[PDB]
Short mmCIF file of N, CA and C and ligand atoms in Angstrom, two decimals:
data_model
loop_
_atom_site.label_atom_id
_atom_site.label_comp_id
_atom_site.label_asym_id
_atom_site.label_seq_id
_atom_site.Cartn_x
_atom_site.Cartn_y
_atom_site.Cartn_z
N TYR C 1 7.88 23.02 16.03
CA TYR C 1 6.69 22.64 16.86
C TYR C 1 5.50 23.56 16.53
N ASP C 2 5.43 24.00 15.28
CA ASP C 2 4.33 24.87 14.78
C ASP C 2 3.11 23.99 14.51
N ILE C 3 2.08 24.12 15.31
CA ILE C 3 0.84 23.31 15.25
C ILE C 3 0.02 23.68 14.02
N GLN C 4 0.25 24.84 13.41
CA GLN C 4 -0.54 25.26 12.22
C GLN C 4 0.17 24.99 10.89
N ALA C 5 1.46 24.57 10.90
CA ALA C 5 2.27 24.54 9.67
C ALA C 5 1.72 23.52 8.65
N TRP C 6 0.98 22.52 9.11
CA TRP C 6 0.47 21.48 8.20
C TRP C 6 -0.39 22.10 7.11
N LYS C 7 -1.09 23.23 7.36
CA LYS C 7 -2.08 23.67 6.37
C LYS C 7 -1.39 24.18 5.10
N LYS C 8 -0.38 25.04 5.22
CA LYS C 8 0.34 25.49 4.03
C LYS C 8 1.11 24.31 3.42
N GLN C 9 1.63 23.39 4.24
CA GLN C 9 2.32 22.20 3.68
C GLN C 9 1.35 21.40 2.81
N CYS C 10 0.12 21.24 3.26
CA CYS C 10 -0.90 20.53 2.47
C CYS C 10 -1.31 21.34 1.25
N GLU C 11 -1.41 22.65 1.34
CA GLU C 11 -1.70 23.47 0.13
C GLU C 11 -0.60 23.26 -0.91
N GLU C 12 0.66 23.28 -0.51
CA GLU C 12 1.79 23.10 -1.43
C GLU C 12 1.71 21.71 -2.04
N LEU C 13 1.43 20.69 -1.23
CA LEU C 13 1.38 19.32 -1.79
C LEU C 13 0.22 19.21 -2.78
N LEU C 14 -0.92 19.82 -2.49
CA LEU C 14 -2.04 19.78 -3.45
C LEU C 14 -1.64 20.49 -4.73
N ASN C 15 -0.93 21.59 -4.65
CA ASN C 15 -0.39 22.26 -5.86
C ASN C 15 0.46 21.26 -6.66
N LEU C 16 1.37 20.56 -6.03
CA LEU C 16 2.21 19.56 -6.76
C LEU C 16 1.31 18.51 -7.39
N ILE C 17 0.30 18.04 -6.67
CA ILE C 17 -0.59 16.97 -7.18
C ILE C 17 -1.34 17.50 -8.42
N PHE C 18 -1.82 18.73 -8.39
CA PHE C 18 -2.52 19.32 -9.55
C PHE C 18 -1.55 19.46 -10.74
N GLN C 19 -0.24 19.62 -10.52
CA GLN C 19 0.74 19.69 -11.67
C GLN C 19 1.05 18.31 -12.26
N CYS C 20 0.84 17.24 -11.48
CA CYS C 20 1.06 15.84 -11.93
C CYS C 20 0.02 15.50 -13.00
N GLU C 21 0.47 14.96 -14.13
CA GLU C 21 -0.50 14.47 -15.15
C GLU C 21 -1.37 13.32 -14.61
N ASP C 22 -0.81 12.56 -13.68
CA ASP C 22 -1.53 11.42 -13.08
C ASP C 22 -2.76 11.88 -12.27
N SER C 23 -2.87 13.15 -11.89
CA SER C 23 -4.05 13.60 -11.12
C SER C 23 -5.26 13.94 -11.98
N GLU C 24 -5.10 14.00 -13.30
CA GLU C 24 -6.18 14.56 -14.13
C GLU C 24 -7.53 13.87 -13.89
N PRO C 25 -7.61 12.52 -13.79
CA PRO C 25 -8.92 11.88 -13.56
C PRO C 25 -9.56 12.18 -12.21
N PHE C 26 -8.81 12.77 -11.31
CA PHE C 26 -9.19 12.91 -9.89
C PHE C 26 -9.31 14.37 -9.48
N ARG C 27 -9.26 15.32 -10.41
CA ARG C 27 -9.19 16.76 -10.07
C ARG C 27 -10.57 17.28 -9.80
N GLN C 28 -11.62 16.63 -10.28
CA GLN C 28 -13.01 17.08 -10.16
C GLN C 28 -13.85 15.85 -9.88
N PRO C 29 -15.03 16.06 -9.22
CA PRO C 29 -15.95 14.97 -8.90
C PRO C 29 -16.35 14.23 -10.18
N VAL C 30 -16.39 12.90 -10.11
CA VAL C 30 -16.72 12.01 -11.26
C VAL C 30 -18.02 12.51 -11.89
N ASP C 31 -18.04 12.51 -13.23
CA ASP C 31 -19.22 12.79 -14.08
C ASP C 31 -19.98 11.47 -14.28
N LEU C 32 -21.15 11.41 -13.66
CA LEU C 32 -22.10 10.29 -13.63
C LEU C 32 -22.69 10.01 -15.03
N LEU C 33 -22.60 10.97 -15.96
CA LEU C 33 -23.06 10.79 -17.36
C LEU C 33 -22.06 9.89 -18.10
N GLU C 34 -20.77 10.03 -17.80
CA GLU C 34 -19.68 9.21 -18.39
C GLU C 34 -19.70 7.81 -17.75
N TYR C 35 -20.06 7.74 -16.46
CA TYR C 35 -19.99 6.53 -15.61
C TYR C 35 -21.30 6.39 -14.83
N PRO C 36 -22.41 6.01 -15.50
CA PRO C 36 -23.73 6.07 -14.86
C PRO C 36 -24.00 5.11 -13.68
N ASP C 37 -23.17 4.09 -13.52
CA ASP C 37 -23.33 3.15 -12.37
C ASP C 37 -22.42 3.57 -11.20
N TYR C 38 -21.77 4.74 -11.28
CA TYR C 38 -20.72 5.05 -10.26
C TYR C 38 -21.27 4.99 -8.84
N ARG C 39 -22.39 5.63 -8.54
CA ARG C 39 -22.95 5.70 -7.19
C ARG C 39 -23.60 4.38 -6.75
N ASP C 40 -23.73 3.40 -7.64
CA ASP C 40 -24.13 2.02 -7.23
C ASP C 40 -22.96 1.30 -6.55
N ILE C 41 -21.73 1.72 -6.83
CA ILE C 41 -20.50 1.09 -6.26
C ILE C 41 -19.90 2.00 -5.19
N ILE C 42 -19.87 3.30 -5.44
CA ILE C 42 -19.14 4.25 -4.56
C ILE C 42 -20.13 5.00 -3.69
N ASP C 43 -20.00 4.83 -2.39
CA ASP C 43 -20.92 5.51 -1.43
C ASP C 43 -20.53 6.96 -1.22
N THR C 44 -19.22 7.27 -1.19
CA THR C 44 -18.76 8.63 -0.84
C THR C 44 -17.75 9.09 -1.89
N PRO C 45 -18.20 9.82 -2.90
CA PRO C 45 -17.30 10.41 -3.89
C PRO C 45 -16.33 11.37 -3.23
N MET C 46 -15.12 11.42 -3.80
CA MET C 46 -14.12 12.42 -3.34
C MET C 46 -13.19 12.74 -4.50
N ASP C 47 -12.68 13.95 -4.52
CA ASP C 47 -11.76 14.42 -5.57
C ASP C 47 -10.88 15.53 -5.01
N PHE C 48 -9.83 15.90 -5.74
CA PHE C 48 -8.82 16.82 -5.17
C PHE C 48 -9.36 18.24 -5.08
N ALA C 49 -10.28 18.63 -5.96
CA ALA C 49 -10.87 19.98 -5.85
C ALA C 49 -11.68 20.09 -4.56
N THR C 50 -12.44 19.07 -4.23
CA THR C 50 -13.19 19.01 -2.95
C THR C 50 -12.23 19.06 -1.76
N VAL C 51 -11.13 18.32 -1.82
CA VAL C 51 -10.14 18.36 -0.70
C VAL C 51 -9.55 19.76 -0.56
N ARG C 52 -9.13 20.38 -1.67
CA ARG C 52 -8.56 21.74 -1.63
C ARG C 52 -9.59 22.74 -1.09
N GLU C 53 -10.85 22.68 -1.56
CA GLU C 53 -11.88 23.62 -1.09
C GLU C 53 -12.13 23.41 0.40
N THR C 54 -12.15 22.18 0.87
CA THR C 54 -12.41 21.91 2.31
C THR C 54 -11.28 22.53 3.14
N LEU C 55 -10.05 22.36 2.67
CA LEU C 55 -8.86 22.93 3.33
C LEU C 55 -8.97 24.44 3.36
N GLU C 56 -9.24 25.05 2.21
CA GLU C 56 -9.24 26.52 2.09
C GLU C 56 -10.43 27.12 2.84
N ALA C 57 -11.51 26.41 3.02
CA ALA C 57 -12.67 26.84 3.84
C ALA C 57 -12.35 26.82 5.33
N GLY C 58 -11.23 26.22 5.74
CA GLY C 58 -10.98 26.04 7.16
C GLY C 58 -11.83 24.96 7.73
N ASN C 59 -12.11 23.87 6.98
CA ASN C 59 -12.99 22.78 7.44
C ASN C 59 -12.23 21.44 7.65
N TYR C 60 -10.89 21.51 7.65
CA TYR C 60 -10.07 20.42 8.23
C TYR C 60 -9.49 20.94 9.54
N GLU C 61 -9.58 20.12 10.59
CA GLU C 61 -8.90 20.45 11.86
C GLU C 61 -7.45 19.95 11.89
N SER C 62 -7.11 18.92 11.12
CA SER C 62 -5.79 18.26 11.20
C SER C 62 -5.44 17.71 9.84
N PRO C 63 -4.14 17.46 9.60
CA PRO C 63 -3.77 16.82 8.34
C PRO C 63 -4.22 15.37 8.27
N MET C 64 -4.49 14.72 9.38
CA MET C 64 -5.07 13.35 9.38
C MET C 64 -6.42 13.36 8.65
N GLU C 65 -7.25 14.37 8.89
CA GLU C 65 -8.57 14.42 8.24
C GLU C 65 -8.38 14.59 6.73
N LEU C 66 -7.45 15.45 6.28
CA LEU C 66 -7.18 15.66 4.84
C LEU C 66 -6.70 14.35 4.24
N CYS C 67 -5.82 13.66 4.96
CA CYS C 67 -5.21 12.40 4.51
C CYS C 67 -6.31 11.35 4.32
N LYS C 68 -7.31 11.31 5.21
CA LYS C 68 -8.40 10.34 5.08
C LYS C 68 -9.18 10.62 3.79
N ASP C 69 -9.47 11.86 3.49
CA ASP C 69 -10.20 12.18 2.26
C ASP C 69 -9.35 11.86 1.01
N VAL C 70 -8.05 12.17 1.03
CA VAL C 70 -7.21 11.84 -0.14
C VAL C 70 -7.19 10.32 -0.32
N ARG C 71 -7.05 9.55 0.77
CA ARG C 71 -7.02 8.09 0.65
C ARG C 71 -8.34 7.58 0.11
N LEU C 72 -9.44 8.23 0.40
CA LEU C 72 -10.78 7.87 -0.17
C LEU C 72 -10.79 8.04 -1.68
N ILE C 73 -10.09 9.04 -2.21
CA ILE C 73 -9.99 9.18 -3.70
C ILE C 73 -9.42 7.89 -4.22
N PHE C 74 -8.35 7.42 -3.59
CA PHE C 74 -7.64 6.24 -4.14
C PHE C 74 -8.44 4.97 -3.88
N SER C 75 -9.08 4.83 -2.73
CA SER C 75 -9.87 3.59 -2.52
C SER C 75 -11.08 3.59 -3.45
N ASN C 76 -11.69 4.71 -3.75
CA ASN C 76 -12.79 4.77 -4.72
C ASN C 76 -12.30 4.26 -6.06
N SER C 77 -11.13 4.69 -6.49
CA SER C 77 -10.62 4.27 -7.81
C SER C 77 -10.41 2.76 -7.81
N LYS C 78 -9.82 2.21 -6.76
CA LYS C 78 -9.60 0.74 -6.64
C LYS C 78 -10.95 0.02 -6.63
N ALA C 79 -11.95 0.56 -5.98
CA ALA C 79 -13.26 -0.11 -5.91
C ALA C 79 -13.94 -0.05 -7.29
N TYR C 80 -13.81 1.04 -8.04
CA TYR C 80 -14.56 1.24 -9.29
C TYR C 80 -13.88 0.57 -10.48
N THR C 81 -12.59 0.24 -10.39
CA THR C 81 -11.77 -0.28 -11.53
C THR C 81 -12.23 -1.69 -11.92
N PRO C 82 -12.51 -1.94 -13.22
CA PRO C 82 -12.90 -3.28 -13.63
C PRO C 82 -11.70 -4.21 -13.72
N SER C 83 -10.49 -3.64 -13.65
CA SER C 83 -9.21 -4.36 -13.82
C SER C 83 -8.09 -3.65 -13.05
N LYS C 84 -7.16 -4.42 -12.48
CA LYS C 84 -5.96 -3.88 -11.80
C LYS C 84 -5.03 -3.24 -12.84
N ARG C 85 -5.24 -3.53 -14.13
CA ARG C 85 -4.39 -3.05 -15.26
C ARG C 85 -4.97 -1.77 -15.89
N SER C 86 -6.12 -1.30 -15.40
CA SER C 86 -6.81 -0.06 -15.84
C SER C 86 -5.83 1.11 -16.01
N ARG C 87 -6.03 1.96 -17.03
CA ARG C 87 -5.26 3.22 -17.14
C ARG C 87 -5.50 4.10 -15.90
N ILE C 88 -6.76 4.38 -15.58
CA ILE C 88 -7.08 5.40 -14.54
C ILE C 88 -6.74 4.84 -13.16
N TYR C 89 -6.87 3.52 -12.92
CA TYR C 89 -6.42 2.89 -11.67
C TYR C 89 -4.90 2.94 -11.58
N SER C 90 -4.18 2.66 -12.67
CA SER C 90 -2.70 2.71 -12.69
C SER C 90 -2.21 4.12 -12.32
N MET C 91 -2.88 5.15 -12.83
CA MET C 91 -2.55 6.55 -12.50
C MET C 91 -2.77 6.76 -11.00
N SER C 92 -3.85 6.21 -10.45
CA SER C 92 -4.16 6.36 -9.01
C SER C 92 -3.02 5.77 -8.20
N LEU C 93 -2.47 4.62 -8.56
CA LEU C 93 -1.43 3.98 -7.73
C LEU C 93 -0.15 4.82 -7.73
N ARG C 94 0.25 5.39 -8.87
CA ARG C 94 1.43 6.25 -8.87
C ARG C 94 1.17 7.49 -8.06
N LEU C 95 0.01 8.10 -8.22
CA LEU C 95 -0.29 9.33 -7.49
C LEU C 95 -0.34 9.05 -5.99
N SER C 96 -0.88 7.91 -5.59
CA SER C 96 -0.94 7.51 -4.19
C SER C 96 0.47 7.38 -3.64
N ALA C 97 1.39 6.75 -4.36
CA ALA C 97 2.77 6.61 -3.87
C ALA C 97 3.41 7.96 -3.67
N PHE C 98 3.16 8.88 -4.60
CA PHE C 98 3.69 10.26 -4.51
C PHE C 98 3.12 10.97 -3.27
N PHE C 99 1.79 10.88 -3.13
CA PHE C 99 1.13 11.50 -1.97
C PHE C 99 1.68 10.94 -0.67
N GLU C 100 1.73 9.64 -0.52
CA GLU C 100 2.18 9.02 0.75
C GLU C 100 3.62 9.44 1.05
N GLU C 101 4.49 9.51 0.04
CA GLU C 101 5.92 9.88 0.24
C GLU C 101 5.96 11.28 0.83
N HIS C 102 5.09 12.18 0.40
CA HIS C 102 5.11 13.60 0.80
C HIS C 102 4.30 13.87 2.08
N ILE C 103 3.21 13.15 2.36
CA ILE C 103 2.38 13.49 3.54
C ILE C 103 3.00 12.97 4.84
N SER C 104 3.88 11.98 4.76
CA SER C 104 4.42 11.33 5.98
C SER C 104 5.09 12.37 6.90
N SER C 105 5.90 13.30 6.38
CA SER C 105 6.58 14.29 7.24
C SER C 105 5.53 15.26 7.78
N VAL C 106 4.51 15.58 6.97
CA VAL C 106 3.47 16.55 7.39
C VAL C 106 2.78 15.97 8.62
N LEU C 107 2.37 14.71 8.58
CA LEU C 107 1.72 14.04 9.71
C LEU C 107 2.66 13.95 10.90
N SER C 108 3.89 13.51 10.67
CA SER C 108 4.84 13.33 11.79
C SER C 108 5.06 14.67 12.48
N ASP C 109 5.28 15.72 11.70
CA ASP C 109 5.59 17.04 12.30
C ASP C 109 4.39 17.54 13.08
N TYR C 110 3.20 17.40 12.54
CA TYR C 110 1.99 17.85 13.25
C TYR C 110 1.85 17.10 14.56
N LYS C 111 1.97 15.77 14.53
CA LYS C 111 1.69 14.98 15.75
C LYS C 111 2.79 15.30 16.79
N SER C 112 4.00 15.53 16.36
CA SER C 112 5.10 15.93 17.28
C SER C 112 4.81 17.31 17.89
N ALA C 113 4.30 18.24 17.10
CA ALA C 113 3.98 19.61 17.58
C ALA C 113 2.89 19.53 18.60
N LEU C 114 1.90 18.69 18.38
CA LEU C 114 0.78 18.57 19.33
C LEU C 114 1.28 17.93 20.62
N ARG C 115 2.15 16.91 20.52
CA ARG C 115 2.72 16.30 21.73
C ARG C 115 3.51 17.37 22.51
N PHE C 116 4.28 18.21 21.82
CA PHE C 116 5.07 19.25 22.49
C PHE C 116 4.12 20.20 23.22
N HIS C 117 3.04 20.57 22.53
CA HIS C 117 2.05 21.54 23.06
C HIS C 117 1.46 21.02 24.37
N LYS C 118 1.21 19.71 24.44
CA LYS C 118 0.54 19.06 25.59
C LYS C 118 1.58 18.46 26.55
N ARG C 119 2.86 18.83 26.42
CA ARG C 119 3.95 18.21 27.23
C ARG C 119 3.76 18.41 28.75
C1 LIG R 1 -12.92 14.05 -13.58
C2 LIG R 1 -13.24 12.82 -14.45
C3 LIG R 1 -12.22 12.66 -15.60
N1 LIG R 1 -13.23 11.62 -13.59
C4 LIG R 1 -13.66 10.41 -14.11
O1 LIG R 1 -14.52 10.35 -14.97
N2 LIG R 1 -13.02 9.19 -13.55
C5 LIG R 1 -12.25 9.31 -12.28
C6 LIG R 1 -12.35 8.16 -11.28
N3 LIG R 1 -12.50 6.93 -12.04
C7 LIG R 1 -11.85 5.78 -11.65
O2 LIG R 1 -11.29 5.76 -10.58
C8 LIG R 1 -11.75 4.63 -12.53
C9 LIG R 1 -11.11 3.44 -12.31
C10 LIG R 1 -11.21 2.71 -13.53
C11 LIG R 1 -11.90 3.48 -14.39
O3 LIG R 1 -12.25 4.69 -13.81
C12 LIG R 1 -13.83 6.90 -12.69
C13 LIG R 1 -13.71 7.87 -13.87
#
């Protein structure tokens, strides 16, 4: 029932994501010189370095907020992809499955700890 345990759990999961080859396109904010129409399609850029820095700054209150930003990485990739068969979109779908498999216990444990705290 540790209300703070999610933060190190999320740091560890981000470490695993940075070791995945599938994260390489998503580790840093998109380069607009490579993709000059990106901000015509994507309103809110997001990447894993931004998520890690926000976490380490103490600017997430809950793992739900981190999860929303990570899911934005994946919805941006789906929105920007010219094809469902894209290399970089295909990498996003595997990485998303990995992330979702690992974040589910982090969210469940946090929400259970908060319920215990307010019992
Ligand atoms: C750090 C750097 C390597 N990032 C990028 O230049 N990428 C990452 C995100 N991208 C896509 O989600 C996408 C879908 C289909 C084609 O690109 C756009 C391009």
